[PDB]
Amino acid sequence: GKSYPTVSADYQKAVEKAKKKLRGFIAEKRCAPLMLRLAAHSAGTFDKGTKTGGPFGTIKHPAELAHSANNGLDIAVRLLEPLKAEFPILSYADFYQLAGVVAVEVTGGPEVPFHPGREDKPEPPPEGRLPDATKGSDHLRDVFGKAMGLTDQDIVALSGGHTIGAAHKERSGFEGPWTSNPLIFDNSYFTELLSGEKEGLLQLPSDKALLSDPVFRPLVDKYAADEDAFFADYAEAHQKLSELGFADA
């Protein structure tokens, strides 16, 4: 359903150079999970009915950074600003989605296709559109489905983003990694989710909701058994997420 815009040769060269620089920077800083979260929080505010929100650069605005759901993302924005300044031709919107793509790649995840051309929009979306970690499957469908326009398969695959990183008691209040390898992108989120609560690892109520839903559970089982299947569905979902409202949504 996508029709991607034309960007200049100079834009495309910038991106390819920005992609490379982001790889080295994100690997060295150890900030891949935070960058993935930044990219996803940027995108996940899209509402399909009104065509508002989405991956359009607004997360850098103080008003959006102030959203409680975005606690700690100011760190991410600050970390990227020197690099972003090396690529003045790129939109923030593109730059942050590119950072998300690279975050997945440099932790060993799938190569998520990337298309340039998002424009930086002037107005952040209203607060409160991002998912609540204490809620369950109905809520996940409200947010990812009714608002964003993503599928049930997308919800499960994207929840697998928790295969990298950790919660922080000073940010959400939850604490610790979902996996034993929080800088490695693999199917371990699902493996852990299935085996039960292991000391030192985190499961949100929203993660656990996947285990009891009739549609979500078969997907968890598939991804735990088949990492290639996970990688394929993840790459599809991340691309869709990163393109919400862009080039047609």
Ligand code: HEM
């Ligand atoms: C399914 C609904 C989701 C809920 C309820 C949720 C909730 C959370 C919460 C509460 C945290 C901890 C923030 C903190 O205290 O630092 C977090 C972290 C994180 N989330 Fe999600 N999330 C969801 C989906 C996603 C998606 C779709 C992605 C990306 C594809 C994602 C990527 C991440 C990453 C990488 C972290 C780790 C951040 C870090 O290490 O600093 N999450 N998520």
Ligand SMILES: N=NC(=O)c1ccncc1
């Ligand atoms: N959680 N913050 C980070 O990942 C980070 C912040 C500053 N420098 C390196 C990494």
Ligand SMILES: N=NC(=O)c1ccncc1
């Ligand atoms: N950690 N949560 C996220 O990254 C996120 C999940 C859904 N929509 C936007 C952002």
Ligand SMILES: N=NC(=O)c1ccncc1
């Ligand atoms: N679902 N809640 C969140 O994503 C969150 C809430 C507050 N601070 C960081 C993250």
